[PDB]
Design a protein around this ligand. Structure first.
Ligand SMILES: *[C@@H]1O[C@H](CO)[C@@H](O[C@@H]2O[C@H](CO)[C@@H](O)[C@H](O)[C@H]2NC(C)=O)[C@H](O)[C@H]1NC(C)=O
Ligand SMILES: *[C@@H]1O[C@H](CO)[C@@H](O[C@@H]2O[C@H](CO)[C@@H](O)[C@H](O)[C@H]2NC(C)=O)[C@H](O)[C@H]1NC(C)=O
Ligand SMILES: *[C@@H]1O[C@H](CO)[C@@H](O)[C@H](O)[C@H]1NC(C)=O
Ligand SMILES: *[C@@H]1O[C@H](CO)[C@@H](O)[C@H](O)[C@H]1NC(C)=O
Length: 288
């Protein structure tokens, strides 16, 4: 259970489909993976020791993507899918460009980040939305942070052209609710992978994003004043045979040594707390 409202409680079984897939690759940041750009600041032809919310070198990712057709498992909405959100998380999300009847699409899972997922708290929801404008497929990314009455079994659905045996249903507030924040963000539907930093500090939530390269740019920030404790990558139901990936590794507060081209491109990094070599390599930045 995520919310605590028995919504459209049909086509649900208790089927064990296993546990989120572990990546064969670990976090290695030795040229950018897991780093972000500084908001309203651009460094050229220089290194820079920097504290921040970075993923842990040697840590694996987990594929939190859940793909359904009609049936949802009750086990999909518990640990280990309903996961702890501490400092933050880093996401490598695949843009599933399923090709059907000539046209190419752009599906990937929604993620909700909250405390209790009840209308008494706020919950962040980062949901993709696709639509055609004269047969050209457009990418949106509907961010919203609201006092949602979340369902026990929240799921999104794919584009209706790919076929759906379920209606989209994650919250039941067809009555208009109190929201701290909501705006849409366009993304390039021709992107191989989308990357996200989601972290919190002193009651403020932070989001970084990129649909080009792996190094994320700043997206938005929002003062909650509360402390976020959980994330859930929602199952996406579809008739078409999509191949979903939402790869997540957690963030902790760490010092990194970053490096920039003359064109301001972060091209190299050192996980400074990973290694006795790395520690030595950073601390030696004070005038020798
Ligand atoms: C806030 O959420 C709670 C549950 O988290 C809702 O309570 C349910 O209300 C319906 C009436 O429509 C009852 O049939 C259920 O038994 C209630 N459930 C529980 C667990 O109490 C409540 O309606 C929501 N209210 C608003 C305004 O969003
Ligand atoms: C984000 O874009 C979507 C594009 O559909 C907007 O959602 C629709 O808003 C209209 C109101 O003009 C409603 O009639 C539709 O029911 C909405 N559709 C969906 C799928 O939610 C939305 O307005 C945009 N959000 C923001 C914050 O601008
Ligand atoms: C309720 O859910 C079932 C299966 O998920 C679906 O067939 C039906 O159309 C849904 N209807 C409404 C109004 O939610
Ligand atoms: C970059 O900085 C170095 C010194 O570390 C300097 O010699 C060089 O002129 C600079 N190159 C560019 C491309 O800015």
């Amino acid at each position: 259970v995520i919310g605590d409202l028995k919504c459209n409680t049909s086509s649900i079984n208790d089927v064990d489909t296993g546990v989120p897939s572990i990546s064969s690759e670990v976090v290695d940041v030795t040229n950018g993976l897991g780093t972000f750009y500084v908001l309203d600041r651009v460094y050229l032809n220089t290194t820079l020791l920097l504290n921040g919310y970075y993923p842990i070198s040697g840590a694996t990712f987990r594929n939190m993507a859940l793909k359904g057709t009609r049936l949802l498992s009750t086990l999909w909405f518990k640990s280990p899918f309903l996961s702890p959100f501490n400092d933050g998380i880093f996401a490598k999300v695949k843009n599933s460009r399923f090709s059907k009847d000539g046209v190419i699409y752009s599906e990937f899972p929604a993620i909700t980040i909250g405390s209790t997922f009840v209308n008494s708290s706020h919950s962040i929801v980062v949901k993709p939305h696709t639509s055609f404008i004269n047969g050209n497929l457009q990418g949106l990314l509907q961010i919203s942070v609201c006092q949602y009455t979340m369902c026990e079994y929240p799921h999104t659905i794919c584009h209706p052209n790919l076929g759906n045996q379920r209606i989209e249903l994650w919250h039941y507030d067809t009555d208009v609710v109190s929201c701290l924040y909501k705006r849409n963000f366009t993304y390039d539907v021709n992107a191989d992978y989308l990357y996200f930093h989601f972290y919190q500090e002193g009651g403020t939530f932070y989001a970084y994003f990129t649909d080009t390269g792996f190094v994320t740019k700043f997206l938005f920030k929002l003062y909650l004043g509360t402390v976020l404790s959980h994330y859930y990558v929602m199952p996406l139901t579809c008739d078409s045979a999509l191949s979903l990936e939402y790869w997540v590794t957690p963030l902790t507060t760490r010092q990194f040594l970053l490096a920039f081209d003359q064109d301001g491109v972060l091209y190299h990094a050192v996980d400074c707390a990973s290694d006795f070599m790395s520690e030595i390599m950073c601390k030696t930045s004070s005038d020798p």
